């Protein structure tokens, strides 16, 4: 059987399928080390499975598109959390107290008329 | 300016120069055309070129061939 999850961050979307057995992760037809060359990103992707002791018990098949490196990592983490709750349904308290259940709604602020950026003003002189 | 197009000259100036050469002598040739190239067949003549107010006389030598007529009649006054 399969358990599914959807995850989102800044501009990215991630689809996660999980099955039982023999921990192995595949992202966009590549391995974790092939895809993410950043230790921070790897740690972010692995955090929930370290939180619930199932690192060597589940197979993970993932797809992701949009955004950058950090945004994709966060989206994958969100999706894994949701799929794990679908799998068990009694880990919700621990995951919520860790803080992985929340969607992080921080987007980019628009530019505005008369400003150089969202909040930066041009230089002012009195005379 | 592209080389596949050839040099640029004004038709009236070209015809006047031809007539002057065939008929020999010439008093200054008056022109308002500062955008025309200087051809090898002008060497020896006197061309009076407009600058905004007056006609400046230029006596053509062979070190000028290939330039525009306007580069020999300045347009601003400064002291």
């Amino acid at each position: 059987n399969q358990y599914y999850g959807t995850g989102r961050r800044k501009s990215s979307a991630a689809r996660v399928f999980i099955k039982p057995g023999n921990g192995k992760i595949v992202i966009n037809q590549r391995s974790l080390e092939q895809y993410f060359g950043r230790e921070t990103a790897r740690m972010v992707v692995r955090q929930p499975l370290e939180l619930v002791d199932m690192v060597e018990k589940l197979d993970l098949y993932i797809t992701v598109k949009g955004g950058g490196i950090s945004g994709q990592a966060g989206a994958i983490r969100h999706g894994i959390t949701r799929a794990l709750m679908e799998y068990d349904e009694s880990l919700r308290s621990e995951l919520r107290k860790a803080g992985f259940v929340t969607r992080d709604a921080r987007q980019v602020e628009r530019k505005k008329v008369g400003l150089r950026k969202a909040r930066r003003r041009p230089q002012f002189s009195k005379r | 300016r592209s080389l596949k197009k050839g040099p640029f000259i004004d038709l009236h100036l070209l015809k006047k120069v031809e007539k002057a050469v065939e008929s020999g002598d010439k008093k200054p040739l008056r022109t308002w055309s500062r955008r025309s190239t200087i051809f090898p067949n002008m060497i020896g003549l006197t061309i009076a070129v407009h600058n905004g107010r007056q006609h400046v006389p230029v006596f053509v030598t062979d070190e000028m061939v290939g330039h525009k007529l306007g580069e020999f009649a300045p347009t601003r006054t400064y002291r």
Binding site: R110 | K4, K5, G6, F8, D10, L11
Partner: protein, 100 residues
Amino acid sequence: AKQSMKAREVKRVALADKYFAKRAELKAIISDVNASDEDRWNAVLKLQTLPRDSSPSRQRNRCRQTGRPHGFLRKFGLSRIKVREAAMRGEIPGLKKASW
């Protein structure tokens, strides 16, 4: 704008409509490679005897209601002031104030 400038524009458009095909032919000759090298010279000498106002680059866009030469928008045929007046009166279909 004065009444003479609009007349200038009308005259320019008329001449440029009149002389369209001849200029295309001569420019095709000049641009094409492997020509006689005398036809090219004659074509260059002939392209400069046509009226100056027959070149489409002597034209300037103006507001259709006032004649203003600055602040022109192509979708509407008007300047900024008249665009705003019509938009607030409700005379431009589909247009309204935006936020996002």
